[PDB]
Amino acid sequence: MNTVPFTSAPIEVTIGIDQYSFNVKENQPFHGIKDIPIGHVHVIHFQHADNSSMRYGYWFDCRMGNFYIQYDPKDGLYKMMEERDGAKFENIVHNFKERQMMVSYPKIDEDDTWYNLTEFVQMDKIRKIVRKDENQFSYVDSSMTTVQENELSDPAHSLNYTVINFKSREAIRPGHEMEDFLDKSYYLNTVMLQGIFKNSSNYFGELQFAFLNAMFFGNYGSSLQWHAMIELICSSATVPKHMLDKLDEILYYQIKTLPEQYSDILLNERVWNICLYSSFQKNSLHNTEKIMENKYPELL
Amino acid sequence: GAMNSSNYAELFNNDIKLFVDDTNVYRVTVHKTFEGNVATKAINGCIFTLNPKTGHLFLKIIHTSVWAGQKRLSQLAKWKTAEEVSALVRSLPKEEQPKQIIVTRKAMLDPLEVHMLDFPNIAIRPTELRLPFSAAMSIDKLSDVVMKATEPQMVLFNIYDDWLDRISSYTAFSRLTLLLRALKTNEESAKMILLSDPTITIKSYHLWPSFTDEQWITIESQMRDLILTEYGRKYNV
Numbered sequence: 001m002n003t004v005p006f007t008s009a010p011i012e013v014t015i016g017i018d019q020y021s022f023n024v025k026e027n028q029p030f031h032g033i034k035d036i037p038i039g040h041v042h043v044i045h046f047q048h049a050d051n052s053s054m055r056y057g058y059w060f061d062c063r064m065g066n067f068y069i070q071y072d073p074k075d076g077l078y079k080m081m082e083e084r085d086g087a088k089f090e091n092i093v094h095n096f097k098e099r100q101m102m103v104s105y106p107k108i109d110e111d112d113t114w115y116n117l118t119e120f121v122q123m124d125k126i127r128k129i130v131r132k133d134e135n136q137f138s139y140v141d142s143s144m145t146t147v148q149e150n151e152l153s154d155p156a157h158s159l160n161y162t163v164i165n166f167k168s169r170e171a172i173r174p175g176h177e178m179e180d181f182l183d184k185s186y187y188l189n190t191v192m193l194q195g196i197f198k199n200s201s202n203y204f205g206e207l208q209f210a211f212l213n214a215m216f217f218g219n220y221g222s223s224l225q226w227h228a229m230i231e232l233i234c235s236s237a238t239v240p241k242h243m244l245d246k247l248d249e250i251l252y253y254q255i256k257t258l259p260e261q262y263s264d265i266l267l268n269e270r271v272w273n274i275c276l277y278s279s280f281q282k283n284s285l286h287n288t289e290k291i292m293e294n295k296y297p298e299l300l
Numbered sequence: 301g302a303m304n305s306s307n308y309a310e311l312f313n314n315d316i317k318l319f320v321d322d323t324n325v326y327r328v329t330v331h332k333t334f335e336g337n338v339a340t341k342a343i344n345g346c347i348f349t350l351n352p353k354t355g356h357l358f359l360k361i362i363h364t365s366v367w368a369g370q371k372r373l374s375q376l377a378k379w380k381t382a383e384e385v386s387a388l389v390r391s392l393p394k395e396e397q398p399k400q401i402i403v404t405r406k407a408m409l410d411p412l413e414v415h416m417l418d419f420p421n422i423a424i425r426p427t428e429l430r431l432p433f434s435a436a437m438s439i440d441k442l443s444d445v446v447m448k449a450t451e452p453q454m455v456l457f458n459i460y461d462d463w464l465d466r467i468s469s470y471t472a473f474s475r476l477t478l479l480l481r482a483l484k485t486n487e488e489s490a491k492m493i494l495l496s497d498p499t500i501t502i503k504s505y506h507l508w509p510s511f512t513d514e515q516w517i518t519i520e521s522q523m524r525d526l527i528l529t530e531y532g533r534k535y536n537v
């Protein structure tokens with residue numbers, strides 16, 4: 001179980017850790033989060049009480065270093081940093097725990113939600129998408145645009161997911177125009193899976209990362225990414241049986257976790273109705289269709 | 301974006317453009333079978349691709365053999381249309397290729413866009429105009445070449461005959477759409493108007509009769525009367 005200490009909390013803020021969250025008051029004696037499960041990526045995120053604009057946060061894996069949070073009064077945000085002095089860090093953490101100034105990652109033992117949302121998400125892959133090689137953790141916020149949004153503006157601060165474009169030469173083989181547009185199996189299996197991602201685990205990892213950035217930061221380009229990656233699978237007539245079964249599990253847990261009150265802005269009516277009721281895979285996502293029909297029957 | 305009454309004169313500027321109409325591509329007769337079920341028999345069709353500035357009509361004849369063994373023909377017909385338009389564009393010298401293609405039905409947008417990905421600078425546009433090009437097969441010489449075709453074939457026409465010698469392309473397009481609208485609303489009556497005077501003939505190299513300027517004014521009035529008529533006969537007014 002690892003720890004992310006905070007130097008202090010000088011400004012009132014709501015702090016998220018994965019799917020959990022808690023309020024910290026201005027100058028409250030808060031010094032971090034303990035008992036963080038090893039083996040998963042994690043996200044620690046922030047919304048200031050005085051400007052709910054710009055949610056922002058950091059993806060990290062405690063196996064990759066000792067990380068802490070410190071407020072920067074010049075740039076006006078809580079920054080993640082790495083402590084290289086391992087003895088300094090252990091000393092700091094132990095004192096804060098002894099004084100009980102830390103919240104405990106509040107995982108119920110029965111609960112596999114975070115595993116289910118991050119099963120295929122790897123820190124190594126997140127760092128290719130979010131380019132800042134000098135840090136081992138990755139900053140994301142509500143306003144960062146994707147490479148695709150930039151094509152349609154700062155490149156250093158962009159989300160480099162693969163751009164999914166169904167009306168593109170990559171997606172459409174010369175001479176198979178109708179075939180490839182109506183059945184996207186070529187684009188999914190040959191271009192994306194064999195060509196770019198290398199395997200379906202990697203594809204699902206980007207899919208899962210995109211959803212989580214959409215949900216935790218309201219990042220619009222990430223929401224577009226998530227839906228495009230779903231639609232590419234549902235619009236392919238030839239998809240390995242194990243991919244379809246895993247996709248149904250992935251989406252089930254995403255739909256289950258989504259805040260009921262954000263369904264209007266995080267779910268695309270067209271994509272979901274197409275995927276569940278018109279697409280080649282309309283009958284292959286039993287768990288997802290059942291939770292969608294019972295939780296969001298309005299959208300459909 | 302979409303072409304409508306507000307940006308109408310754009311059709312007659314000096315940017316090459318083509319209208320594409322796919323209505324008459326997939327044509328069928330419906331009939332009863334010996335068992336008393338219903339079946340369709342395809343007949344030859346055509347793509348109607350028109351330059352509204354010059355009157356050049358690229359009439360690609362769609363022979364019934366292209367449907368053999370194929371499923372979902374109404375969907376296929378849109379993609380076949382897009383395929384043949386793309387082939388036409390590729391066959392033209394660069395300086396004759398269109399800068400825009402306007403499709404008369406919105407269901408042609410995605411098929412044509414996908415077939416034209418190689419031509420990112422050619423704009424594919426819909427229109428809010430209700431153009432009467434489905435009536436092209438009421439022009440006898442066009443219907444004749446379509447029905448006589450025994451194989452795929454492209455035939456070139458000028459749908460304005462020699463009108464541009466005397467009138468502008470705006471006025472020629474207006475005459476064309478009035479004639480086609482009439483033929484679509486009451487083909488028999490429209491054809492009666494156009495031919496009732498045997499002294500006015502259709503040149504071998506023309507589609508419509510050799511009316512004088514004054515005779516076109518009369519003809520055009522008779523076509524408006526017909527259209528307003530049928531509009532009453534229809535709605536009782």
Ligand SMILES: O=C1C[C@]2(C=N1)CCCNC2
Nearest residue numbers: 128129160161162196197
């Ligand atoms: O431009 C990119 C694409 C990629 C990282 N940068 C490659 C791995 C798969 N998607 C993210």
